[PDB]
Amino acid sequence: AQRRMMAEVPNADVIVVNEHYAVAVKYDVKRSAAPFVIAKGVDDVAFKIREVAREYNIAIVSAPPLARAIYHTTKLDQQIPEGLFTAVAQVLAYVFQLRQRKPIPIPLNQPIPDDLKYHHHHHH
């Protein structure tokens, strides 16, 4: 949650959002096979990421379990875990296929893996 992180949000391909979550995701294959997180924050920092993204016409999409799973499993400048690739790649496909405001609700097409979930859950 830095000015240095906030300066990177203009380079995002998408913000996955939804106590508030926002993760700014980039796909740049000359650097990494998997998308990577270039900004992330919760609550107010999440809304500052969103406001910058909207200023720069960067798609913001609501998929709450994906937003949370990315945030919990991916540090800044790190690739998302392999278990989230297909879900993020399908969000990216939708973003890239948009034609030339609340976030766009996108249904997930499969579950988020158990091992990337239950971050706040009290196990017995």
Residue numbers in the entry: 252 to 269, 271 to 352, 359 to 382
What do the study authors state?
FlhB was identified and initially characterized together with FlhA and FlhE in Salmonella enterica. It was shown that FlhB consists of two regions—an N-terminal transmembrane domain (TMD) followed by a cytoplasmic domain (FlhB-C). FlhB-C has the ability for self-cleavage between the asparagine and the proline of the conserved NP(T/E)H motif. Overall, these findings show that FlhB and FliK are important for the switching of the export specificity from rod- and hook-type substrates to filament-type substrates during flagellar morphogenesis.
First, we wished to determine the crystal structure of the cytoplasmic domain of FlhB of the main polar flagellar system [FlhB1 (Sputcn32_2563), henceforth simply FlhB], which localizes at the C-terminus of the protein (SpFlhB-C; amino acid residues: 222–376). The crystal structure of FlhB-C was determined by molecular replacement employing the structure of Salmonella typhimurium FlhB-C as search model, and refined to a resolution of 2.1 Å. All FlhB-C structures share the central domain composed of a four-stranded β-sheet in its center, which is surrounded by four α-helices. This autocleavage occurred at the highly conserved 269NPEH272 motif and leads to two tightly associated subdomains FlhB-CN and FlhB-CC (residues 252–269 and 270–376, respectively). However, the structure of SpFlhB-C differs from the other available ones in two main features: First, the N-terminal fraction of helix α1, which connects FlhB-C to its TM domain, appears disordered in our structure. Second, our structure of SpFlhB-C resolves a PRR involving residues 356–376 at the very C-terminus of FlhB-C, which was not observed in previous structures. The PRR interacts with an extended canyon-like surface area formed by helix α4 of FlhB-C. At its C-terminus, the PRR is also in close proximity to helix α3. Our analysis identifies the following hydrogen-bonding pairs between the PRR and helix 4 of the core domain: K360-Y353, G358-Q349, G358-Q352, R359-Q349, R357-Q352, Q368-Q342, and Q368-A339.
